[PDB]
Amino acid sequence: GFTDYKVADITLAAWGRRELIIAESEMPALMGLRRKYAGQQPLKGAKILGCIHMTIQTGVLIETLVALGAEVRWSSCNIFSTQDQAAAAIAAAGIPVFAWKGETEEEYEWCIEQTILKDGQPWDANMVLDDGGDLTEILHKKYPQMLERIHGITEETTTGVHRLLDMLKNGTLKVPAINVNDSVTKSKNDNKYGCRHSLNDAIKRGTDHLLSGKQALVIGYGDVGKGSSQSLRQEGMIVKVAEVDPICAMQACMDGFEVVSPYKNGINDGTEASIDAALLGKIDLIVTTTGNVNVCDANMLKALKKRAVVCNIGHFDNEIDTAFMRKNWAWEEVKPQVHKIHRTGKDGFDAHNDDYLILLAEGRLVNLGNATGHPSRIMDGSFANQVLAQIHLFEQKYADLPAAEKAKRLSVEVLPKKLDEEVALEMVKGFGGVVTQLTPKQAEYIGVSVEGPFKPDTYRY
Amino acid sequence: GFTDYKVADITLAAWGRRELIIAESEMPALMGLRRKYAGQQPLKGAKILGCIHMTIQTGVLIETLVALGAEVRWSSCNIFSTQDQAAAAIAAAGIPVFAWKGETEEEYEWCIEQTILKDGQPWDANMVLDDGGDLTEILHKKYPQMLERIHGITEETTTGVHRLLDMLKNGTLKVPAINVNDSVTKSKNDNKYGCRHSLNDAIKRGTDHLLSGKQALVIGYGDVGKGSSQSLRQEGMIVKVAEVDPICAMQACMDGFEVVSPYKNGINDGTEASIDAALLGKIDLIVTTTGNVNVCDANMLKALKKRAVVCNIGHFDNEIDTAFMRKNWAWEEVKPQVHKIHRTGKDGFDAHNDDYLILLAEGRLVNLGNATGHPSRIMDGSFANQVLAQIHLFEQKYADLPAAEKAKRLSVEVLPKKLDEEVALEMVKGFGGVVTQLTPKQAEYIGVSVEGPFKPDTYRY
Amino acid sequence: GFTDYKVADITLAAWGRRELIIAESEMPALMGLRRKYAGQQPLKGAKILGCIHMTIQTGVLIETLVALGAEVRWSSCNIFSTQDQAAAAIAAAGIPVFAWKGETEEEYEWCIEQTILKDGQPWDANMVLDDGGDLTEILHKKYPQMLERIHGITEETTTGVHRLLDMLKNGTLKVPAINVNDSVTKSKNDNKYGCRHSLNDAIKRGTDHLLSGKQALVIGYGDVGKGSSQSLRQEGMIVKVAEVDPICAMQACMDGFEVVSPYKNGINDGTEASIDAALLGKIDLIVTTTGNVNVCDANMLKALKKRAVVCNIGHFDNEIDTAFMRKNWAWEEVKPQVHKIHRTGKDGFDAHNDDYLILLAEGRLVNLGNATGHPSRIMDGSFANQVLAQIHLFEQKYADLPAAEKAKRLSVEVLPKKLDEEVALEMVKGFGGVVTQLTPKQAEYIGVSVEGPFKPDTYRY
Amino acid sequence: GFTDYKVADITLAAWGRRELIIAESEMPALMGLRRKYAGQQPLKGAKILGCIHMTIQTGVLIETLVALGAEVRWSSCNIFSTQDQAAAAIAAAGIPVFAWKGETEEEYEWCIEQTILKDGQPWDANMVLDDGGDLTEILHKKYPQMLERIHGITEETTTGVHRLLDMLKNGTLKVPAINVNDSVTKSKNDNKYGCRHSLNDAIKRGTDHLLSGKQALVIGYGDVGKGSSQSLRQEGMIVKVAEVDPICAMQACMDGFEVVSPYKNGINDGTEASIDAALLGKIDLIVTTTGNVNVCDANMLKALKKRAVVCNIGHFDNEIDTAFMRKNWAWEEVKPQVHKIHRTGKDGFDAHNDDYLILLAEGRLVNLGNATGHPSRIMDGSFANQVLAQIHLFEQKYADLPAAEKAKRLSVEVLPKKLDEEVALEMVKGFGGVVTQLTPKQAEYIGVSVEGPFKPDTYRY
Numbered sequence A, B, C, D: 001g002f003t004d005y006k007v008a009d010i011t012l013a014a015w016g017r018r019e020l021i022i023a024e025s026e027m028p029a030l031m032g033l034r035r036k037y038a039g040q041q042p043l044k045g046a047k048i049l050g051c052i053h054m055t056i057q058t059g060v061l062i063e064t065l066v067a068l069g070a071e072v073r074w075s076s077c078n079i080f081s082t083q084d085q086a087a088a089a090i091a092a093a094g095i096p097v098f099a100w101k102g103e104t105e106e107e108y109e110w111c112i113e114q115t116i117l118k119d120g121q122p123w124d125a126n127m128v129l130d131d132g133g134d135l136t137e138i139l140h141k142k143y144p145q146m147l148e149r150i151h152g153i154t155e156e157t158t159t160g161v162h163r164l165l166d167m168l169k170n171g172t173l174k175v176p177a178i179n180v181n182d183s184v185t186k187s188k189n190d191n192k193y194g195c196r197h198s199l200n201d202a203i204k205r206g207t208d209h210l211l212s213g214k215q216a217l218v219i220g221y222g223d224v225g226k227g228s229s230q231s232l233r234q235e236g237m238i239v240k241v242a243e244v245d246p247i248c249a250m251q252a253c254m255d256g257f258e259v260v261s262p263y264k265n266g267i268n269d270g271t272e273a274s275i276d277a278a279l280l281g282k283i284d285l286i287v288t289t290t291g292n293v294n295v296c297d298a299n300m301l302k303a304l305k306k307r308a309v310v311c312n313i314g315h316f317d318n319e320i321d322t323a324f325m326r327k328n329w330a331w332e333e334v335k336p337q338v339h340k341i342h343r344t345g346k347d348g349f350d351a352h353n354d355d356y357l358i359l360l361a362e363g364r365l366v367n368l369g370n371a372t373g374h375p376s377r378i379m380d381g382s383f384a385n386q387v388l389a390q391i392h393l394f395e396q397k398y399a400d401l402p403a404a405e406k407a408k409r410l411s412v413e414v415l416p417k418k419l420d421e422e423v424a425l426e427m428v429k430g431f432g433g434v435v436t437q438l439t440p441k442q443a444e445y446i447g448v449s450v451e452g453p454f455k456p457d458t459y460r461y
């Protein structure tokens, strides 16, 4: 008689459950934590508000937290990223989840609100797991009294960490947080290799376009930009890379990419004259990866080669000026998450017009919107970190401390390197890899313990 | 009338000078510093003891320091790494240099001593530029009075930095140092991409072996191991990777390599029984990249496939147990830096014996020993950092500080990120790359200045 | 009032039509033929029985033949390869098509029969377009009177060509054929690069498995094996290749793959003892590419690592002994075209059993079964060849020739090189590529016409 | 007391002999033929004029022919391709060889003449082995009476085969020939993979330039162009490809290269206006691979980016207009086979001029001129074919036939596929590869013998 959920189609549960069982076999770090901590129940009494893409991989995360003793209430952090079979399997297990693929913005906020409210009143939540900071922001702005009982936030992604650090700098962050993004087994695994796997996957599913031999422009060359450029280059695209950070641009050059700017001499002065129209007129695919605002702007969209594909793999859709396209150009839906944007005008469209762009996922995160996001064996690292971070902040019991004790603990921290290494070891063993053990003499020679950690905290990998 | 040098053949100078003029055109960051600072003469009065591979690239470094006002006395930090035409060109310019390819160990020490002593007495040195820490160690052990007047050390390489940090922790470091290795435009340029360019280069020059289709084992997957594995994989080798650090091993797996140990279950217990003989018996090439001791040990050498190539690209030769091979097996020189090691015994050799290994550079740094090390356009980054570090420590004038002020400044530091970025920008422009400029709104959106720095100090790239 | 069709769901037609309009923009060679020949109507009077995967790409092929004057009746050549929106769009256009994704074998035969018969009697067919030879075989065995009036067969694929050549050698082939497979713009485009695009695509859609870091075994290294191995290697798989042809195996070695056999010393003597159990126990993915029989046999399936993925990209499913798996092991459907094969026995299954294989598309062509097959821009080459071949055989009018003249024309031929080159030129222009024109002196120097052909017929590319 | 030779330095013989002994271990097909045929002496009585690059690999070929009973007289087919240690080792073995690195054109012709003449009179030669057709041409034009006693020519390379086919077409070829180039274990091994190994090798040895991140233009995309493009792309160059053959251009696009022409719209009308100056002004490296004339012409050389590298890997230097550069621009030798070409004029040069090109090997085959050509394990295939071809033509005894028998045998033929496969098998075993044996049922299923051949003669691989 469980009704405390909202999903697209509960009859997808058995399919979702089959995929969860496969995903468990692909997630040895996460399932190792389930086995290790199940007897101890370290999350007994935890009540976790979770806001992260309701995929099969998030399902394994949810059920690990529950297996460790937690209660949860769950929503997705993006309108297109839910896998409806994953949501159904979680709801069928008696877990409150409010998520479906293809929400409206109003439905998106309503879903988050259904996690925060139980029976019309604030749930007695005491932990937060977030991806991008939307739940964290709603709590601080609209439900500040609830933060009086919450011990911590564990934040998944680069954009969400930025938002937390802004709150900390401004003195508005109310509970301590763990930056899960910056574990090496997250940032340099999920952010990079996850996008390598799933960017070309999403473009193929949405368009079935041949990529070999065509010209791509990747805006950004951080972790997501690195993985995205490789996703395209390994398919045979001719990839050009734009960057504002000269160190990242240096890496792009050494990795074998030509570094270009959409703007003449790199100067974005707001005029059409500043656009390198020759460059943009040759691009078949543009991908934004920055976490910044308006990096694929209206003048760039006007200058792109006819029939170019436009997509964003950063957290928020404002990387592309889709608002300009909504105001000026006609949208022809090809299928869900695939639209032809007719640059002829806004008053209907000609089904045979040759002057259109193909926009994927309406500019929302394309790997999750047009495919299934990162694969389970990659998300294993990110979500093992999430579980460890939830255990730590819940055990620390910040909400129970005296006000003086709270002041010294109000921070944004990362996990210790030793735990990062232990997650990595389980990942390596999952591939069948065999890590060598240092001899006592070798450990002494390089100045480390045989057990690790093996690198100083300054090490960049 | 200049005689204050010792090189292989001074008649090679004109050839060296032609290569220096080409290298200047490949080193825009370093030559940009030469142009920016020449008028100001920031190194006027500096007297630099330099100990680093006497290559064409080091020649451009030397002449940049001199162009900024320094005097120098120079030696190589490896017995096989000098390019004799580079050494000749520097000596022909009136610069004291003591370096040739193929020194003995006694000659190597004598060359360092010739930089320290001028006319039989300590030179009036006040700065140190070092690669690996050998000059730094000799000064601390044998010439402490000279360190009294030295303002700082700028150290090039991972191994040298480790030695500095040991001295700092023991309270034996006498002057402050800059860790040049850990600029991103050094570590994630030189250490990685430099070895990608130069490892396969050296193996080809030493052996002319086809690499495609053959089996390689790379010991280590830090920056050098990453570049080395790519150097071989891009040639079509089937590359396996060993590691003690599970995070580095995770990267190897995600990069498409099989992670293996020379020892059964990774346990190095000193017996032949622990060697994975089946694995080592299929390896055609082994490369050590660790900075550690005895990572290609006697039992591994005994188990390698007949005619395997053995080489080391870490700083010191003790990565491979070459002492064991000198004691037990006969060495047939093919040509300089290429030896067949006959596993039949040590009492002469059979020129037609099939049971040998090919050892490159007698186990010393193979890229420099059997080829020319990293290319100018990569060394541009490392050496622009060296020049900036020399300017900073020389301007700080630590030797002239009172004892109480010395105590506050005795440290090992890295260059600020802003300078790292400015070096990278010159490198990118050298490729013809165009970096984009943030708009004021974008810079505000991500919380940075339009001029940078663009990343927090914690960022790993 | 059109009812002469059978598809899954006619309401998918508008979606299919949108994808056809996109595919037209990705198929410049095929659309160029449509424009070049539309006025001349070279297929006026042609009545084409077509049997080839009812995809969007085949839709553009069908509508090109119709635009040139043909009437057609169409079926798919595989039970899982139809895209239902493509079938719907073709039926909605008034074209007889009998095809849906997920036919039974009985439905598959019924669909072919519906093209052959119209209103219960033989259609007035005079041309055949086939992929794999199934329609060709049915006509020869069951409808010889129909072949009397058929001018030729244009055969798409390696397996179908082999079947034609068998009939020719036995004197049972009744009408001439064009081997479309062996145009360079087919075999060395479609067979190789098509599988490079679509193999990893299908595995991702079926399983969402990370491929990087895992072990693959590709059986075969012809055109399909070459593209398949690249599809996996570019994702970071560690790919091993099996072959019976030592020249193809040599290419695999030089391409950077380890060449292995499932059998000890390559000897397939039918016993379990001949299986290299150590090798197969480390394989995460096996792909068959051979066009041969039982190349992934029962003993290999028994020896594979638990949870390995098993798939076939050759034309027919008998490359894998799926009959053995149907007889002995329980099948758990995950979703359409994805089955867990439980090696515990056949009397039901345990949903949590760890000892299963994942079989894709029930062993049928995996790229079409689990994804969408090759992309439009690659199929452009194959299908431009098909149109040219249909024009040529239809113009030759073999059925109308006297017996003595038929005897001189009964053959299996390829298209002339000049047409192969003209197809390629349109493909290159589609990428924006610019082919250089020889000067008269250069053309004389190498002995060719400025217009081509540029290579002798013996050239292998 | 052997004096019938001319080499650079006979004291290099011991070094050459050590490298020959290593090369034997890298050439299993060739050494397998030595072992197989040594007892039978199938070349007893053969007297072979040989004209092919006097490398270590050619040394193993020579000594295989001698071991099979032949006498030989040898020269190089290029002025820069000899390895002086290889020439010395052969001369020290008592084999007549006339070859050194850095011959003049006059010395080149004199060396060929020393093979043709013994003691001032024509040698009683009866077999010819040639690479490029220079010896074959001299025999036909200047020594036609010698061809009356010669049983055949075995020709190594694409350009030499073209010359033979021209003679055959004109009725001027006097003896039958075997096209060794067109074995698959030659053309699709040597021509492609050999250049992949040795192009980047030669550029690194000549210039030590970083290649990653720089722009290359490869003229041609046949076998040499394919291997050359990969040599550069795998180092991280951004490679553009020019072609006159649209099928080869199609392959370039699908392999992930942008296809461009040096001429606007591909039209080479002889004017400077036709040069795409924007394209050429961005190219850092141009490589000619065509076997054609003037594919890197004077107007292209004028338009290249300052400091671009120019080289040719086709057989003859006339691919580049070096004559134009000799007449107009000053040459500054950096070192042997490396020249800066100063575009400021011809009246001396400024050592610091920035407007120069770097020409490698004076436009002669760059892999052999600036490095050591293809590696032994690749040349194994080519030279096993050469030995088989020499055995066959010598056994056929064309010169001894009646005039009527000669007419029916005057042809240019390739080796049978069965032998091509047997060479390939030895190559595969050299990598440790294991070829699978077909079962009787499988061989029947695909219509081949279990022993091969496995493909029809039309197969392109």
Ligand SMILES: NC(=O)c1ccc[n+]([C@@H]2O[C@H](COP(=O)([O-])OP(=O)(O)OC[C@H]3O[C@@H](n4cnc5c(N)ncnc54)[C@H](O)[C@@H]3O)[C@@H](O)[C@H]2O)c1
Binding pocket: A157, A158, A159, A160, A190, A191, A194, A195, A219, A220, A221, A222, A223, A224, A225, A242, A243, A244, A245, A248, A289, A290, A291, A292, A295, A313, A314, A315, A316, A365, A366, A367, A368, A373, A374, B436, B438, B442, B454
């Ligand atoms: N879709 C996914 O699965 C996924 C995964 C991880 C992270 N993310 C999101 O992707 C975004 C990027 O994350 P990251 O970890 O790569 O961050 P990052 O900071 O490592 O990289 C962002 C890069 O963008 C560059 N950049 C900023 N403004 C630019 C501009 N105007 N033009 C060009 N380059 C510009 C920055 O210099 C930086 O190198 C964030 O929004 C993050 O939350 C998405």
Ligand SMILES: NC(=O)c1ccc[n+]([C@@H]2O[C@H](COP(=O)([O-])OP(=O)(O)OC[C@H]3O[C@@H](n4cnc5c(N)ncnc54)[C@H](O)[C@@H]3O)[C@@H](O)[C@H]2O)c1
Binding pocket: A436, A438, A442, A454, B157, B158, B159, B160, B190, B191, B194, B195, B219, B220, B221, B222, B223, B224, B225, B242, B243, B244, B245, B248, B289, B290, B291, B292, B295, B313, B314, B315, B316, B365, B366, B367, B368, B373, B374
């Ligand atoms: N030849 C060159 O041009 C060049 C360039 C840069 C640095 N170096 C030298 O190369 C060495 C490595 O430098 P780095 O910057 O890559 O250091 P690093 O710390 O980044 O990498 C060394 C790696 O070796 C691994 N390792 C240690 N012991 C091991 C063992 N027994 N088995 C397997 N892996 C083991 C460590 O876990 C680590 O990841 C140093 O000696 C450095 O000075 C050489």
Ligand SMILES: NC(=O)c1ccc[n+]([C@@H]2O[C@H](COP(=O)([O-])OP(=O)(O)OC[C@H]3O[C@@H](n4cnc5c(N)ncnc54)[C@H](O)[C@@H]3O)[C@@H](O)[C@H]2O)c1
Binding pocket: C157, C158, C159, C160, C190, C191, C194, C195, C219, C220, C221, C222, C223, C224, C225, C242, C243, C244, C245, C248, C289, C290, C291, C292, C295, C313, C314, C315, C316, C365, C366, C367, C368, C373, C374, D436, D438, D442, D454
């Ligand atoms: N799925 C697709 O889209 C697609 C595309 C083109 C062709 N095909 C089909 O794929 C198959 C292969 O086509 P192809 O053009 O690559 O043929 P091919 O003749 O070029 O290659 C087949 C290869 O299999 C090898 N082989 C045969 N028996 C073997 C065995 N027991 N073990 C290992 N290797 C073995 C052969 O030596 C040969 O090199 C055919 O059935 C063809 O019709 C499928």
Ligand SMILES: NC(=O)c1ccc[n+]([C@@H]2O[C@H](COP(=O)([O-])OP(=O)(O)OC[C@H]3O[C@@H](n4cnc5c(N)ncnc54)[C@H](O)[C@@H]3O)[C@@H](O)[C@H]2O)c1
Binding pocket: C436, C438, C442, C454, D157, D158, D159, D160, D190, D191, D194, D195, D219, D220, D221, D222, D223, D224, D225, D242, D243, D244, D245, D248, D289, D290, D291, D292, D295, D313, D314, D315, D316, D365, D366, D367, D368, D373, D374
């Ligand atoms: N250096 C080496 O080790 C080596 C090895 C093998 C062959 N070769 C030589 O290399 C040359 C090429 O041999 P191949 O086997 O690759 O021949 P190929 O016929 O396979 O390729 C030559 C290519 O050049 C193209 N081409 C011709 N004129 C052109 C032009 N003006 N612009 C652009 N492309 C043009 C042709 O279309 C063709 O595809 C020959 O001279 C051959 O003897 C050298």
Ligand SMILES: Nc1ncnc2[nH]cnc12
Binding pocket: A052, A053, A054, A055, A056, A057, A058, A194, A368, A372, A373, A374, A375, A379
């Ligand atoms: N599959 C996935 N599940 C959850 N969050 C993700 N972020 C990226 N891919 C994801």
Ligand SMILES: Nc1ncnc2[nH]cnc12
Binding pocket: D052, D053, D054, D055, D056, D057, D058, D194, D368, D372, D373, D374, D375, D379
């Ligand atoms: N190493 C080599 N020896 C002889 N001929 C060659 N052609 C190309 N490389 C060669």
Ligand SMILES: [K+]
Binding pocket: A055, A057, A372, A373, A374, A375, A376, C208
């Ligand atoms: K997924």
Ligand SMILES: [K+]
Binding pocket: B055, B057, B372, B373, B374, B375, B376, D208
């Ligand atoms: K160098």
Ligand SMILES: [K+]
Binding pocket: A208, C055, C057, C372, C373, C374, C375, C376
């Ligand atoms: K498709």
Ligand SMILES: [K+]
Binding pocket: B208, D055, D057, D372, D373, D374, D375, D376
């Ligand atoms: K060689």
